[PDB]
Write a protein that binds this ligand. Sequence first.
Ligand code: IRG
Ligand code: 0OO
Length: 337
Amino acid sequence: ERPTFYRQELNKTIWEVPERYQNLSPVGSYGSVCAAFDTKTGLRVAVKKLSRPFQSIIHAKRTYRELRLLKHMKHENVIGLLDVFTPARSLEEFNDVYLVTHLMGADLNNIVKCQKLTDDHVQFLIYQILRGLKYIHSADIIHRDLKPSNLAVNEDCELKILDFGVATRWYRAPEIMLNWMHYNQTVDIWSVGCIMAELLTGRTLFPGTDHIDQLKLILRLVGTPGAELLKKISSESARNYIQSLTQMPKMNFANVFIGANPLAVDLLEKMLVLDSDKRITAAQALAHAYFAQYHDPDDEPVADPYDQSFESRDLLIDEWKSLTYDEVISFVPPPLD
Ligand SMILES: Nc1ccc2c(NC3CC3)nc(-c3ccccc3)nc2c1
Ligand SMILES: OCc1cccc(Oc2ccccc2)c1
């Protein structure tokens, strides 16, 4: 049987959650989230109410996607699903979805408010991001939106990558700025690079005002593409644009990041490569000397394969809705261990 629910109202939204969750308290409003106490395990949790999960085909599919992703993630440094529930008793009345996950202290701008964050602290936080990224990437998933607010950190400096929930453009790979279609997983590595840079210096590495400015600032540090990179660019206007602007040489990263651990500077050089074919991967970055104290090859697991064939399907709202319902139904709680 499904358990006992109770209703209430928080800000502008109704909330119908199991009695198992208590002391709901808004924390930030894709949907709004409450901190709650979970009576069954004794932990504080985050409960997200999806906003009109089935508003359109695009919403319906997004809802399905997020549920499928969150159900698959089982790794210390990736946000995972504690619970998913609807008040609804049947598919006919299935209208709301709530997701339950660990409540973590802050996110990375908040958890890194001490501008000059320690080098040992950056090691451990970046290590953990890369460990989560290895796992995510191994499933053929690209995050695409890595940024400080997508990194949840508790008081112990333990980090989890959040799927969803300071401009996005600031952490965005330049191939994406340029609207390249066939980017790879290393767009996330670029973002880690920008994050690490910001943690080591206290400043946003590339605070572009828009996509043009963003590129300009990026090229300023890493240099304008060489002939090797240019010859891989399939768009004429893109090729002509970057070939048109003033040719910057790559800066010396040791000079730009003065006094930072030389190993951190070296990793940054490997992450912030303009050409994504030459960018370091998550797995490679974890073996980098900079993570000497943390890197353990037998405890950096990969994910079970992840079936995202659904992404190429065009279905009706009710079909996505029902697939989502099946996913809510078949959810097996993570073990109390
Ligand atoms: N193998 C590759 C490697 C890198 C690439 C890149 N990135 C460079 C920062 C500009 N950009 C583009 C591209 C293609 C079409 C339109 C706009 C951009 N392609 C790339 C192909
Ligand atoms: O520290 C902010 C935060 C931590 C953990 C979860 C969170 O939002 C959620 C909550 C449930 C599912 C997906 C994301 C936000």
